[PDB]
Symmetry: C3
């Protein structure tokens, strides 16, 4: 059922930190991959931080090559490039809070 | 042991090639049961999405206390309903990309 | 494996919410998620007595409250002396469902 369930804390160069969880679930013919993201901090601009090789692999796997994600106060896109995660945001966020983004594939 | 008593998924496509994956899950939490609809599309939606659903998905969708599913996507809001095995998703605004979202209810 | 608290709260005006509070372990990480559902509308804040167990769970958030997105607006859930308060960003003709979590190690 659940074949991957990993979590890690990432921090950018100015001390903003995020917890990310990557979950993979098998549902008969379908596989579901969910990215969960949490930060108590605000973001003025994009969040860029080194990510584990395993989280990077998971992020790369998305059919869109990136992860559109809703937070309470705005929208983000999560991507990875050479082990650096980037979360770009639609507007500055005084607090990020929590959100998730998934896809299903068969 | 698992709390998940139902976990089904299916892919729907409309006459215009837009496609959605839907997952229906039921989780038993003692006195309460949660039923969740998960929806995903990489496509945009100009207007409502209509496609045939399985008998199982249709039954799950019908069971909601409101008779339909208010659902948040990143760029707008939808209502998912079913009528004679045709699923309809109506959207609040046109969406350049739908992305993912979920809608649940809890019942005792 | 996950641990859940679930209950239905009602205010003095008949608005009802269901809450599920889930705790999950992911190695060095703990994830706590609050799930909230109401089919009702809300003009202003929802206030109702909550169980000691839900109150305890709610208090554990590092921010001391739960920023939560519903389809039509944002809320903050807090607890004070076993009374749950959900404050909302704008009036909601229908609350719907939403969830709020944190993960910490």
């Amino acid at each position: 059922k659940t074949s991957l369930d990993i979590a890690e804390e990432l921090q950018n160069d100015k001390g903003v930190s995020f917890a990310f969880q990557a979950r993979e679930e098998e549902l008969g013919a379908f596989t579901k991959r969910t990215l969960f993201a949490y930060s108590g901090d605000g973001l003025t601009g994009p969040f860029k931080a080194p990510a584990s090789a395993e989280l990077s692999s998971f992020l790369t796997a998305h059919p869109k090559g990136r992860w559109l994600i809703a937070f309470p106060l705005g929208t983000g896109i999560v991507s990875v490039d050479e082990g650096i995660l980037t979360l770009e945001i639609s507007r500055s966020l005084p607090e990020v809070g929590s959100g998730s983004s998934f896809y299903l594939t068969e």
